[PDB]
């Protein structure tokens, strides 16, 4: 019945891992800092209308355990009736938290909901929560588990993407992200992180390397650092895809998503909720959908998830003005760009996670808010957002400027 509108979409600057700025900031503060700014923007808003606070977090351990979404509600002084839920759908945790928030508004049982995510990877590493797929030999053997860094090299091997092809895309991301900061496209949504005294800690995506050259990207080693340094996964994937002889390892540290900290918040509510609170709807969510593909290759989920969203929204590829896919691996974007013929002037127009970083629980909401601003800056009408989820999952979302 009711239509779900996006009223605000902010994020923190993504801070690098090694000697990063946000290493001293506990991930709870990053969310509170964003709640403080939503207060500073709407001091007359009745926070009691806010019925839920949904946050994505892929490693809910230590600083991020114990329902951090509820901890942010209490530590920030929000009303006790604001609830707070943490959820984990791997990389799409941030976008699913927005999709879940949007669906709660459509049912009518919730009036106004904050959604987003948070991930402080410099403090809580990836995979710290353990896992059933990877650490139970019964199921690890049954469903052929392969880390994403190898499923991404396989996509390049099957589709014929060379080391020059993937490094060429990484250079494109570093540039458009540098053009975005220079053009001031991120000025209104990136909220600088500060301490308890007001002093600045971070005011820019410090993982960016705007001086990246095509030659510097070829000097790097193939991704042999975390899980790919183990033996076995090379041959395990080729048992599933029997028609492939050799895996061409093309992904490095320059063409893969960086490891950064950060957080994002999205304010979603019904039409009557925004009018009653004196809010202006900036975008409308048209459709969401979940699909998936082969979990061995693990990173082809966005292609069927996008077609399912376009079908339910009654639209095609031509009706979309901007495409935004998470840059977890360069070949995942190029695979998505080949399955559906998409022009580069529509795909990640303001750079992506290769340059700016990939905070797991928050990336879904971050790239969502990126498309909200770029829809207004270009005065375009529609935008589509998907991600490549682990385990071969896929989540896609269509927003429409209002």
């Amino acid at each position: 019945s009711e239509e779900a509108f996006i009223y605000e979409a902010i994020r923190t600057p993504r801070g690098k891992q090694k000697n990063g700025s946000l290493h001293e900031v506990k991930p709870l503060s990053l969310v509170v800092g964003l709640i403080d700014e939503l207060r500073k923007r709407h001091p007359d808003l009745d926070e009691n209308l806010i019925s839920d606070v949904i946050l994505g977090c892929v490693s809910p351990v230590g600083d991020q355990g114990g329902d951090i979404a509820r901890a942010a509600v209490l530590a920030s002084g929000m009303p006790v009736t604001s609830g707070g839920v943490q959820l984990n759908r791997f990389a799409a945790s941030g976008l699913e938290a927005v999709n879940t928030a949007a669906q709660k508004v459509r049912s009518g049982w919730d009036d106004l909901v904050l959604a987003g995510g948070v991930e402080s990877m410099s403090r809580v590493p990836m995979g710290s929560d353990g896992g059933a797929m990877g650490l139970d030999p019964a199921t690890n053997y049954d469903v052929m588990f392969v880390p994403q860094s190898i499923g991404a090299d396989l996509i390049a091997t099957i589709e014929g993407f060379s080391r020059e092809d993937v490094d060429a895309y990484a250079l494109r991301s570093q540039q458009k992200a540098a053009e975005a900061w220079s053009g001031g496209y991120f000025a209104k949504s990136v909220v600088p992180v500060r301490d308890q005294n007001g002093l600045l800690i971070l005011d820019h995506d410090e993982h960016m390397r705007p001086d990246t050259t095509k030659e510097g990207l070829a000097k790097l080693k193939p991704a042999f650092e975390g899980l790919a340094a183990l033996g076995g996964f090379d041959d395990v994937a080729l048992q599933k895809y029997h028609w492939v002889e050799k895996i061409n390892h093309v992904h490095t540290g320059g063409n893969s998503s960086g490891i950064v900290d950060g957080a994002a918040l999205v304010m979603i509510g019904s039409a009557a909720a925004g009018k009653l609170q004196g809010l202006t709807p900036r975008a409308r969510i048209v459709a969401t959908a979940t699909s998936g593909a082969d979990p061995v290759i693990m990173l082809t989920g966005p292609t069927p998830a996008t077609r399912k969203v376009l079908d339910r929204a009654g639209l095609t590829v031509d009706d979309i003005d901007l495409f935004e896919l998470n840059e977890a691996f360069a070949s995942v974007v190029l695979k998505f760009q080949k399955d559906l013929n998409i022009p580069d002037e529509k795909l990640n127009v303001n750079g992506g996670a290769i340059a700016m970083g990939h905070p797991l629980g928050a990336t879904g909401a971050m790239i969502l808010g990126t498309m909200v601003d770029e829809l207004e800056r270009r005065n375009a009408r529609r935008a589509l957002i998907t991600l490549c989820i682990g385990g071969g999952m896929g989540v896609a979302t269509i927003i429409e400027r209002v």
Binding site: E24, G62, Q196, L199
Partner: protein
């Protein structure tokens, strides 16, 4: 960098033949080494010289040239730090810790020679060394008392202490309460590593330890344990299972100790300690600096810096003392009465080294008065703090006697006889002809006017009031009440004596209720009125404890006898209706007479607002809720807290206007150390200008909140004209 940006040089350089630098700190602008701008520039120039000449340097020795090693920091600067100066305070402590961090990671053994006191920033410099050798001398203290001023150890104290002992042992024993340690206790807990006999053995032994360290442990030479690979924090990190189980109880137990009082300093220390343990050392230091900047720019830390530093130095300087009077040495001391007061008075007077003639109504009572001094002398020896030889000889200086002929030769009398108008003039008239003519006729008095009591002697110019506080041994305040006929030399003679027994004096002009009894009365009276208004008793005890008081008011109304408060109201009702004016009684007087009617008149009579069994308090009286219908009014707790604090503050301002007190330093110190006013306010008078409510901050915010309490609780909360609109 190592500099802040033309001050003096406060550090002397001296290198020996083996390549061991001796950094002797000698600040010309004072008698002690302070962490001021002259130090930062002088230390920055010394840190840079160590790195540029590291090829020929093998060890470092940090020494001092003054009496004390290094004490505190620039309080005059920290107290002026506005909230907009948070950037400069952060940069300054980051500059200081960067000097210490470079001194740490120098790859060369660094030893500290602590000759005297190492307090505040002084100990923070010693913790940056890889070895600490201190000298055992009477007066050498080593601690981090930054929390006592609303601050925290910002020079890496929190970061390095937690690194040495863990979160629990460091916060409990060193950081939370600002504990000072003797040189023997410091080595026992790990602060100091080795001790020596005299200060002349410090520098020669510190260098001998470096040659030992370089020859025996060449790799670990100049590397802290937390700078090594396989370092494990004692007690674990917030992620290990051992500490993560009891970590939720750390903030809870801290709130049990503070009773919910608004003191952000101990809370900030615990956060920096735990948050610092979750990251590396450099990130922990930066986190530590953020919390230190938050305290200095706050209001509570300035209230404590104003009272516990600038006001205490002014009283020991002689502010409330006639500046144009010399010194009259005291020979013998006479003490009349030997109760709980006369016994403690004779103890602190002899512990300083003065002959005492303790007299009472008998000869056996003087033994119980001398025995209370010997009961504390057992603890003086059982604790091993005394010499057991010269200390046990101090008891021979006290001469407990009953014959008035023993007062022959006494030049200072302190009458601790019980309060009675005719009894005081009778005992004093008996003893004033025996003691010397130039003897001070001090008299510990509760509320009786000295102007009336001074007529009981001949030389009224030597008669004065010397009010102590029970227990006399522990309480540090002495309230000197100046009568009308009291000479200004008698004030100076007692003012010197109070500084001689190690206590803090204040001067009060003779007024009804003096200053201590008058102000603390409004505190308990505001609580009794709340009970009569129909407020739950448990809220009143929570309101008192959360305000910052050491003892809740209803508990205090039982300590101080409840029938005692009755005749206090009868004496003031007698001092107004005799003058014809209409006496407007306080609403608390009804609640008192109601309890007196029910036979519950304090802990002494066996039962009061609480219930007592064999002299031990055991919970509130259950019938209290039914007698006053507790629960018919549930006001906001902050209104309860501000009612008790404003009453003492408003009554204090009236004491300054009426001339009861002279300076505001005596009001702040007197209210804190006498009637237990919350230390976070900085005193009953500092609470006026340091008020931080929801309507602003300062004197102007006070008046609005006071006029808000007046239109909702009574016109008695209206501010006087001295600070009026």
């Amino acid at each position: 960098s190592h500099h802040h940006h033309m001050p003096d040089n406060t550090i002397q350089w001296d290198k020996d033949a083996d390549g061991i630098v001796t950094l002797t700190m000698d600040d010309p602008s004072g008698s002690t080494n302070v962490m001021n701008e002259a130090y930062i520039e002088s230390m920055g120039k010394a840190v840079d010289r160590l790195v540029a000449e590291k090829d020929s340097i093998t060890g470092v020795v940090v020494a001092s040239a003054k009496k004390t090693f290094f004490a505190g920091g620039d309080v005059k600067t920290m107290i002026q730090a506005r909230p907009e100066d948070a950037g400069d305070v952060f940069n300054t402590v980051e500059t200081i810790k960067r000097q210490l961090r470079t001194l740490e990671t120098l790859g060369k053994p660094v030893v500290a020679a602590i000759n005297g006191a190492a307090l505040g920033g002084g100990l923070e410099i010693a913790l940056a060394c890889h070895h600490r050798i201190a000298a055992d001398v009477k007066g050498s203290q080593l601690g981090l008392p930054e929390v006592t001023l609303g601050l925290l150890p910002g020079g890496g104290g929190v970061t390095r202490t937690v690194r040495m002992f863990g979160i629990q042992n460091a916060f409990v024993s060193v950081l939370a309460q600002g504990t000072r340690f003797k040189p023997a206790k410091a080595k026992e807990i790990g602060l100091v590593d080795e001790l020596v006999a005299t200060v002349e053995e410090l520098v020669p032994a510190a260098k001998a330890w470096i040659k030992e360290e370089l020859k025996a442990n060449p790799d670990g030479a100049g590397v802290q344990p937390w700078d090594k690979k396989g370092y494990k924090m004692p007690g674990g990190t917030p992620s290990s299972p051992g500490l993560a189980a009891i970590l939720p109880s750390f903030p809870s137990n801290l709130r049990k100790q503070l009773k919910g009082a608004p003191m952000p300093a101990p809370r900030a220390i615990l956060a920096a300690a735990v948050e610092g343990a979750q990251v590396d050392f450099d990130t922990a230091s930066r986190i530590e600096s953020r919390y230190f900047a938050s305290l200095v720019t706050g209001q509570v830390a300035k209230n404590m810096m104003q009272a516990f530093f600038f006001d205490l130095q002014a009283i020991n300087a002689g502010g409330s003392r006639p500046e144009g009077i010399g010194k009259t040495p005291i020979k013998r001391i006479g003490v009349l009465g030997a109760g709980m007061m006369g016994a403690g008075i004779a103890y602190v007077s002899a512990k300083a080294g003065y002959e005492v003639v303790l007299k009472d109504v008998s000869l056996e009572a003087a033994a119980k008065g001398k025995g209370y001094s010997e009961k504390l002398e057992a603890k003086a020896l059982e604790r091993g703090r005394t010499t057991q030889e010269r200390s046990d000889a101090l008891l021979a200086r006290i001469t407990p006697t009953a014959d008035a002929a023993d007062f022959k030769g006494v030049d200072f009398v302190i009458e601790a006889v019980f309060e009675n108008q005719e009894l005081k003039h009778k005992v004093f008239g008996e003893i004033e002809d025996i003691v010397e003519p130039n003897a001070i006729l001090g008299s510990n008095t509760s509320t009786l006017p000295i102007t009336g009591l001074a007529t009981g002697v001949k030389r009224q110019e030597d008669f004065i009031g010397i009010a102590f506080f029970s227990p006399v041994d522990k309480m540090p305040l002495v309230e000197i009440i100046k009568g009308e006929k009291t000479s200004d030399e008698a004030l100076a003679r007692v003012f010197d004596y109070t500084l001689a027994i190690g206590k803090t004096p204040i001067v009060v002009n003779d007024s009804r209720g003096f200053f201590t009894s008058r102000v603390i009365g409004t505190f308990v009276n505001e609580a009794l009125a709340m009970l009569g208004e129909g407020v739950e008793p448990a809220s009143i005890e929570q309101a008192g404890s959360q305000a910052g008081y050491p003892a809740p008011p209803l508990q205090l109304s039982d300590e101080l006898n409840l029938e005692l408060m009755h005749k206090i109201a009868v004496a003031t009702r007698k001092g107004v209706e005799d003058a014809g004016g209409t006496y407007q009684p306080h609403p608390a007087e009804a609640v008192v007479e109601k309890m007196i009617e029910l036979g519950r008149s304090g802990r002494l009579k066996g039962a009061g607002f609480y219930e007592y069994a064999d002299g031990k308090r055991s919970g509130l009286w259950p019938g209290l809720r039914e007698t006053f219908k507790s629960g018919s009014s549930q006001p906001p707790l902050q209104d309860m807290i501000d009612r008790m604090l404003f009453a003492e503050a408003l009554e204090t301002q009236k004491c300054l206007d009426e001339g009861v007190l002279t300076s505001t330093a005596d009001a702040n110190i007197g209210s804190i150390m006498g009637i237990g006013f919350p230390p976070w306010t900085g005193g009953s008078a500092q609470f006026i200008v340091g008020y931080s409510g929801p309507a602003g901050t300062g004197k102007a915010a006070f008046v609005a909140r006071a006029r808000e309490l007046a239109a909702a609780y009574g016109d008695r909360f209206l501010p006087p004209e001295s600070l009026l609109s």
